[PDB]
């Protein structure tokens, strides 16, 4: 039974990555939004 659950302990060490993927979305959006907004700043002059 301990081995059965020793394996589960590793199964659980194996959500952070999906948040990491999200981290990159956060980065891309803000980076590109700054460019979109500067393009808007000119359009809005």
């Amino acid at each position: 039974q301990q081995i059965d659950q020793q394996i589960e302990e590793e199964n659980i060490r194996q959500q952070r990555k999906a948040l990491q993927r999200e981290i990159e979305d956060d980065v891309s959006k803000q980076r590109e939004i700054k460019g979109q907004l500067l393009a808007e700043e000119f359009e809005r002059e």
């Binding site: 081995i3 020793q6 394996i7 590793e10």
Partner: peptide, 23 residues
């Protein structure tokens, strides 16, 4: 005596098995 032997040795397989599960 041989049974306690074989058991105490056998258990170390179980600890190698732990090493094997870690791989």
């Amino acid at each position: 005596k041989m049974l306690e032997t074989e058991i105490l040795k056998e258990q170390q397989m179980r600890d190698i098995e732990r090493e094997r599960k870690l791989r």
